[PDB]
């Protein structure tokens, strides 16, 4: 189209429609370029922000962005726009530029184009005391309700008011005299910003409604019959320039603008990033209004602001803007702003197409007391920066030197989370998926966690190569030894074993692992998932029969079969996993106390309101009845509605809002 558009409106609203209107106000644009803002802030200067947008709108072929602009004047809030409107934003920018041009060569450019002279008068009936109050104006507000065209609404604006019915002019010494209060014009500015009162408020309630009445406006607007005195050789004939339009309603809509940029009759629809040619009827007669289907919504389209230019001052306002009209100080600065921005994006494109893989060693598995191999928050990984679509062989090659281990004495066991929420080491061969990308091997997982099996250096130096693993008939299992006396879990490494191998044949290995005698009576459990720890019934059966759904990364927890186990808190390993599942440290902070540190209490997830309150009251040396707990929401972090004392559910239900990653915390208060 030649003219470039502005990037998509994101509750920007009318700002774009207004920017284009000001941008194609050529005489204004030239003054914008001639502003000393080479020493201002790069992200807090409104005039430079405009100079950026105007420059891009003139040279760029890509949809011009307005990020920088919204940050410069605190309207970056996603709702702080309908609080104001076009006439206000236009006053914000222009009075910010006018303020920033006082002293420059283009001093007072804004009043020359937009400012006109207006006189409000008050003439008494009996006495002859007038009130010639003279004011300037940049924007003219017009009435819509009951109006058919501009010619009517303009008369309504200059209509003579009467003051009767207990409403009388406070003359002072003459008391309350009945007078008039109409408005008259002295001069009409070259550029007329006429906002239309279509968003009148609705009392009551609430609070603003849009008037879709059919209001007309001409392409040629003679206004020489509205001044105090006519002016020959300079009639007030105005030509339509900009038509700002809205589709929808007050509480939600879409903004576009029909512009006549060189004022030649060639109109263009500036719908955001899509600039297109359009007819004159499509820009004028189609924007009068009339349709009022609340159901239909978009589209019920009509204009809310118009811009006219004086026919005599038409050639000067829409003056040709050459590229030489922009100071090199301004140019070179914006060029470097983008050179830094373009370089940054290149880095961010490299922030993409990259995945980091976390390597965990088996030394982390040692000493773990929770479920599974390791505690997610306590584990220390070895992170690597990997190409997203790098081959599997390239990763292994890079891992060999960075770890100081041979490329043959290591095996990579990927960590895949199972269906029942247990992240266990999966299997993946080196030569099988060698020519495959990492992002498809991880299956769109980033970051990716992989367990690294390394040969024990105590044997490697002596001479020991890492054994071969047959994916078809071999399975890798992990072992854990439980000591009831200490009530703790002791890690016993892992072992490769045939699938057809009986549990019985694996028993001498377990005894030697934990430092026991051969033919020692043991009790074996399978750690399936937390709080589930099924016991192996028969020992003289294969691995495929004993463990349900036999896979690589399965855990077998064993313990010494001894009558002394009964003489302890946690006899079996199954009971141990029940505590770890039921026990939970709850933080109880007082509601009335600001920033209360609180106190932790060890409870069970199967405690009802009674058992919970009884324990907390015991912790606080008081009667439970004097405690009022509150239903919580972790994310909102604020105590919701108070908790009744006849609550049937348990503590588990009250903590469903809290992720396991977060410390549980309930709120209370004293009665």
Curated annotation (Swiss-Prot):
Signal peptide (from-to): none
Entry's Gene Ontology BP terms: DNA alkylation repair; monoubiquitinated protein deubiquitination; negative regulation of gene expression via chromosomal CpG island methylation; negative regulation of gluconeogenesis; negative regulation of NF-kappaB transcription factor activity; negative regulation of proteasomal ubiquitin-dependent protein catabolic process; negative regulation of TORC1 signaling; protein deubiquitination
Maturation and modification: Isoform 1: Phosphorylated. Isoform 2: Not phosphorylated.
Induction comment from the UniProt entry of this chain: Up-regulated in regulatory T-cells (Treg). Down-regulated during neural progenitor cell differentiation.
EC number: 3.4.19.12
Keywords on record: Acetylation, Autism spectrum disorder, Biological rhythms, Chromosome, Cytoplasm, Developmental protein, Disease variant, DNA damage, DNA repair, Epilepsy, Host-virus interaction, Hydrolase, Intellectual disability, Isopeptide bond, Nucleus, Phosphoprotein, Protease, Thiol protease, Ubl conjugation, Ubl conjugation pathway
Reported regulation of activity: Inhibited by N-ethyl-maleimide (NEM) and divalent cations. Tolerates high concentrations of NaCl but is inhibited at concentrations of 195 mM and higher.
Taxonomy, superkingdom: Eukaryota
pH dependence of activity: Active from pH 7.0 to 9.5.
Annotated disorder: Hao-Fountain syndrome: An autosomal dominant neurodevelopmental disorder characterized by global developmental delay, varying degrees of intellectual disability, autism spectrum disorder, poor or absent speech, and mild facial dysmorphism. Most patients develop seizures. Additional variable features include hypotonia, hypogonadism in males, and ocular anomalies.
Function: Hydrolase that deubiquitinates target proteins such as ARMC5, FOXO4, DEPTOR, KAT5, p53/TP53, MDM2, ERCC6, DNMT1, UHRF1, PTEN, KMT2E/MLL5 and DAXX. Together with DAXX, prevents MDM2 self-ubiquitination and enhances the E3 ligase activity of MDM2 towards p53/TP53, thereby promoting p53/TP53 ubiquitination and proteasomal degradation. Deubiquitinates p53/TP53, preventing degradation of p53/TP53, and enhances p53/TP53-dependent transcription regulation, cell growth repression and apoptosis.
Protein name, entry field: Ubiquitin carboxyl-terminal hydrolase 7
Gene it is expressed from: USP7
Covered range of the whole protein: 211 to 881 of 1102
């Amino acid at each position: 189209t030649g003219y470039v558009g502005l990037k998509n409106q994101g509750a920007t609203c009318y700002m774009n429609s207004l920017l284009q209107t000001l941008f194609f106000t050529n005489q204004l644009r030239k003054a914008v370029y001639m502003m000393p803002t080479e020493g201002d802030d790069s992200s807090k200067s409104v005039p430079l922000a405009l100079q950026r947008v105007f420059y891009e709108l003139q040279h760029s072929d890509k949809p011009v962005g307005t990020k920088k602009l919204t940050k410069s004047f605190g309207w970056e809030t996603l709702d702080s726009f309908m609080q104001h409107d076009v006439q206000e934003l236009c006053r914000v920018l222009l009075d910010n530029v006018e303020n920033k041009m006082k002293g420059t060569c283009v001093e007072g450019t804004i009043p020359k184009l937009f400012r006109g002279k207006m006189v409000s008068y008050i003439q008494c009936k009996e006495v002859d005391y007038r009130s010639d109050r003279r004011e300037d104006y940049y924007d003219i507000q017009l009435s819509i309700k009951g109006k058919k065209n501009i010619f009517e609404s303009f008369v309504d604006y200059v209509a003579v008011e009467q003051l009767d019915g207990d409403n009388k002019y406070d003359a002072g010494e003459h008391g309350l005299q009945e007078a008039e209060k109409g408005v008259k014009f002295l001069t009409l500015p070259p550029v007329l910003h006429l906002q239309l009162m279509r968003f009148m408020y609705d009392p009551q309630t609430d609070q603003n409604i849009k008037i879709n009445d059919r209001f007309e406006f001409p392409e040629q607007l003679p206004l020489d019959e509205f001044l105090q005195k006519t002016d020959p050789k300079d009639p007030a004939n105005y030509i339509l320039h900009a038509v700002l339009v809205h589709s929808g309603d007050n509480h939600g809509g879409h903004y576009v603008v029909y512009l006549n940029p060189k004022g030649d009759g060639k109109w263009c629809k500036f719908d955001d990033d899509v600039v297109s040619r359009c007819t004159k009827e499509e820009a004028i007669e189609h924007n009068y209004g009339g349709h009022d289907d609340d159901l239909s919504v978009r589209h019920c389209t009509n204009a809310y602001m118009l811009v006219y230019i004086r026919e005599s001052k038409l050639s000067e306002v829409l003056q040709a803007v050459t590229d030489h009209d922009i100071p090199q100080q301004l140019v070179e600065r914006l060029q470097e702003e983008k050179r830094i921005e373009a370089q940054k994006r290149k880095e961010r494109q490299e922030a993409h197409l990259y995945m980091q893989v976390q390597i965990v060693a088996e030394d982390q598995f040692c000493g773990h007391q929770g479920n599974d191999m390791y505690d997610e928050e306590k584990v220390k990984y070895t992170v690597f920066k990997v190409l997203k679509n790098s081959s599997l062989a390239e990763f292994v090659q890079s891992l060999s030197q960075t770890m100081g281990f041979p490329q043959d004495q290591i095996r990579l066991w990927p960590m895949q989370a199972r269906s029942n929420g247990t992240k266990r080491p999966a299997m993946l061969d080196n030569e099988a998926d060698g020519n495959k990308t990492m992002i498809e091997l991880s299956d769109n997982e980033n970051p990716w966690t992989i367990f690294l099996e390394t040969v024990d250096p105590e044997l490697a130096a002596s001479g020991a190569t890492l054994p071969k693993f047959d994916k078809d008939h071999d399975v890798m299992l992990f072992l854990k030894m439980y000591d009831p006396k200490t009530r703790s879990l002791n890690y016993c490494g892992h072992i490769y074993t045939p699938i057809s191998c009986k549990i019985r044949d694996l028993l001498p290995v377990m005894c030697d692992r934990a430092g026991f005698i051969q033919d020692t009576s043991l009790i074996l459990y399978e750690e399936v998932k937390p709080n589930l720890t099924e016991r192996i019934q028969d020992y003289d059966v294969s691995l495929d029969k004993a463990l349900d759904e036999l896979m690589d990364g399965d855990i077998i927890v064993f313990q010494k079969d001894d009558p002394e186990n009964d003489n302890s808190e946690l006899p079996t390993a199954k009971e141990y996993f029940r505590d770890l599942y039921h026990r939970v440290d709850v933080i109880f902070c007082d509601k009335t106390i600001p920033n209360d540190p609180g106190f932790v209490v060890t409870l069970s997830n199967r405690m009802n309101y009674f058992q919970v309150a009884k324990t907390v009251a015991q912790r606080l040396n008081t009667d439970p009845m004097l405690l009022q707990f509150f239903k919580s929401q972790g994310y909102r972090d604020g105590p919701g509605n108070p908790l009744r004392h006849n609550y049937e559910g348990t503590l588990r239900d009250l903590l469903q809002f809290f992720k396991p990653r977060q410390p549980k915390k309930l709120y209370y208060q004293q009665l």
